[PDB]
């Protein structure tokens, strides 16, 4: 009865209305995207690989 | 997804304090003369109905 | 819209109630509202607030009555009117409680749909006479091997487990369920045991875990699980043992065979105590009320095995409490310990030397023993009885120069000791229990290497089922050996051992 | 490929054996078994490029 | 406010009763504010006592509490604010900073108060925290969400223990943390503060990754009480609405059931075993079954607890060794014998390490761990009489790995630089299975007892094997 006047007229004469997009993204993780899966340069150029493994070695017994 | 769900909940809150705001309007009117008088008449019914 | 439904529910409810007892607070503190008015109430009474709170009333005084709030005191304030429901206690009772967790009022915790019952009676009622009450002819099997041999249990048949705390105290309780749901298969009603868990204390997560467990096994199909959780008022927790009988009544009344396991009747006891203390009633012995053993001693008489007169039906009870340093001297435990016919106690050092379950053989009794046991078990574990306390006596003399007979003992000791250690959450058939049992009385592993003994017996089950599985289901369905059984069985036994 | 790495570590270990002074071995092997045990513990992180759009 | 306006009447201590007029009824839990040169001394309704005479509880202090003085009802439970400036400020009671950053940003305010969320909302836990340190992993695994409980001795590195969970643990895991002081000195408080500004985690510009709610000793019992639930909202919070999992830390909660003790003697509620509170149970457990894993959010609290004369069967400790999930036991015996942490291997034990849980590996080796550390523990006796010269040649070996193992568990921490000057060791999970599976195979018998002593992982063993052997 009382419990009808009241809901009947405030679900009826009074609804709410969703917020900006910015109010539920200010709330939220935004997103930016990760960059790049990562790429490294070439290396051990030259005959500097070559001949620092050839002295090197001699990692070998007497 | 979070935050959408959440403002669900909230609505339902803001539902709950524009209900308030209705309970107010009904103590303003006289609602609160006619209804309380219904109230009357029909505790006395009830009360009849004992 | 969700709001629309809701407050159609709520438009529902404009009933108007001539009360013809109402009450007033007229101060409320600790929960202990003290009312004004309520002259028609009865002891006990079940009273909504206008908070719509529900309370007991433990003291009629005689200008007010000082109700205990079920609920909390957050809702509660001064002068609220006290309706009078006019009813004592009572709580559904009925058949669909199976597979359903309730909390102590009967309303579902796990919310899964309105309770099925056939009735709502009172939970104050009294036990079954002693010419109502007839002898436990029937045995009841955990899945234990130990425990089903050397502590056998019966139904209608009350025995404590008193043990460490939560130190598997909830394992030991569960395998009992899980070896219930081979037997709940089993069409008899007597072994259609309806299991009742009722979890004092215990917290809604911990509650979960049990459920999700429950429910992992299927177990609940037959399962019903009273919680009266930590958050829970102590006022339920109070009347949460004495509610859960109720349940137990109707399938014991209804003939059929059912088990209630109070865990842990400790925490009943706490909740009396802060009850007591907050309503003035005197303290007694460890802090605890006088007439605690009152309580506990009309809880556990009501299960009970009847006579045969009486339909012939039980509730077999396994209480738990929980001995918080080992205290039987504790004034719970002593009088518990009196009331119970059996007792298990688990004891710590075995539990930290891995022997899970951690079963203390000495301190566990049973006193109704081989009425509530199988023949067969009966037969190839008096000689296991015997084994293991030399074993205990032997072992002590374990420690340098020692006699041959000393040392026999020793290795067949720790064999059969290895032999009756079981791992978590696996239950057993009796067939099963007395071939291995056997096998160990007769040395045959003990002989046998401990390292070999695990991986023996899981090749011993398969080599039983591949040779004569028809052993295995005779032994089931004979349920006593005959000499050619032991016979036969002993070829089998010596067959497997020479491999 | 990754066999052959492995296959060809163990081989090492008894062919340095026979030339004894190794140190190079040592920092062959660790990385091998590194990166493969690394790049497929990697690639059994992955989540491939994926988003929800049937639920979310 | 109210216009209920209350007259103090009877000023006894904390407790202070009220004389609210005629025709005007408070509400049980409501917060009333006094205008006082204390600010508003803020007071709990916790009785009516009835004729609008309440009998509640004061949060500061009563002195120069004038008779009949005017107390507005500011009515239910004190609403503290939240936010996510929550996070790097330490926060009183009654909400306010402490660091006097100012006032905590009030986007929303909570009560105090809640209640806990119900049986079909809990959603169980089943997943394995790390928190590298080795003995904790294998013998007591902990497990996200967890309630781990550190009972152990009087601050004996219990503080030393936390701050090394915020070292690893928290600063690892995205999701915020709330350090909670009940009753704990302001001298460990700005070492606390001034420590977790160095590590960063509090960051004064720019969010900290946690939040701090010191209350302290000096305050009235009544707000040591209830800093707890305070702490408790903060969490939810974070938990339900920003849904970011809490890495909950409180000290120490043997405070909290002291503080209950002192009100219930002071509000005339006969106290129950070993003066504790009538109530004790119930409020222990209403605490702990507000902190859950919830859906919403999981949260992991790492309970301080003081074991009172390091008696754990007294029955504080020991009503809230129950609802605890992950019980940790920290001990002086094997802190004096050199061994950090401090932690009683046997007596740890978390309830996850069950064979499958923890995989059968981790579990047949701490199963392995167990009965050598038993099987020590069992021939101590027999050394002390007999002397260990009879004894078996692998009970010999079992002892040796015993002794390697005892100082296996000697591992450094970062946060006992401060202490020891030793830095600390993370070792993997996969690598502390291994290096305890290796030690109980006997591969590791040749390395010295030192070489074993105050390391890390199986590198670190090493490699202060060949330290020694150099």
Known sequence: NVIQDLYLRELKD??????????????????????????????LQGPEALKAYTEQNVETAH | ????????????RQLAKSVISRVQSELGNPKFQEKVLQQSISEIEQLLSK | ???????????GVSDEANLNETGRVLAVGDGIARVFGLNNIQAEELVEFSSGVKGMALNLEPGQVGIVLFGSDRLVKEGELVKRTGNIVDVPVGPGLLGRVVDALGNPIDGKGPIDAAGRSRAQVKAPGILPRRSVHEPVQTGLKAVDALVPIGRGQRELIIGDRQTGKTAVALDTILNQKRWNNGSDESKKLYCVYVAVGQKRSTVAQLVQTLEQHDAMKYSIIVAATASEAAPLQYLAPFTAASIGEWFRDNGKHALIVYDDLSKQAVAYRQLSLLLRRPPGREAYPGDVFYLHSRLLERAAKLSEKEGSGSLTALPVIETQGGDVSAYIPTNVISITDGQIFLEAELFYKGIRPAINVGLSVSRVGSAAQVKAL??????????????????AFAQSDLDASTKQTLVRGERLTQLLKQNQYSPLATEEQVPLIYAGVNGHLDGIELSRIGEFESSFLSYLKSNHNELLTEIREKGELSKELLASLKSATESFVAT | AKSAANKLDWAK???????????????????????????????????????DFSHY | STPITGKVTAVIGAIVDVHFEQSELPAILNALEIKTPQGKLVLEVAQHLGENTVRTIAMDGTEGLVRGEKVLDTGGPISVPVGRETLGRIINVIGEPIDERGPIKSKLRKPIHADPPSFAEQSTSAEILETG??????????????????????????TVFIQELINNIAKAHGGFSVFTGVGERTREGNDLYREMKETGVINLEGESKVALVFGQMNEPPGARARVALTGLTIAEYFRDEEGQDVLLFIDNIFRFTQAGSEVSALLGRIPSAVGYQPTLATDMGLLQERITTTKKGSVTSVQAVYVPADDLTDPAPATTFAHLDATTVLSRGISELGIYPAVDPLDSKSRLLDAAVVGQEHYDVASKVQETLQTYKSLQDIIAILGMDELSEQDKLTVERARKIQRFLSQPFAVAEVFTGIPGKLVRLKDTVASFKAVLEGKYDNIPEHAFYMVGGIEDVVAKAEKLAA
């Open chain 1, 14 to 43: 009074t609804k709410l209305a969703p917020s900006t997009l910015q109010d539920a993204e200010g709330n939220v993780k935004p997103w930016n995207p990760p960059q790049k899966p990562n790429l490294p340069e070439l290396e």
């Open chain 2, 1 to 12: 997804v979070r935050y959408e769900a959440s403002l669900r909940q909230l609505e339902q």
């Open chain 3, 1 to 11: 819209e969700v709001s629309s439904i809701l407050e159609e529910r709520i438009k």
């Open chain 3, 378 to 395: 009966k037969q190839v574990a008096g000689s296991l009885k015997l084994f293991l306390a030399q074993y205990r006596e032997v072992a």
């Open chain 4, 13 to 51: 270990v008894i062919s340095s054996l026979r030339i004894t002074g190794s140190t190079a071995t040592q920092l062959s092997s660790f990385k091998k078994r590194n990166d493969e045990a690394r790049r497929q513990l990697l690639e059994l992180q992955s989540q491939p490029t994926e988003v």
């Open chain 5, 133 to 158: 340190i080795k003995v904790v992993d294998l013998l007591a695994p902990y497990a996200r969400g967890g309630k781990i409980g550190l009972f152990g001795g009087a601050g004996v590195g219990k």
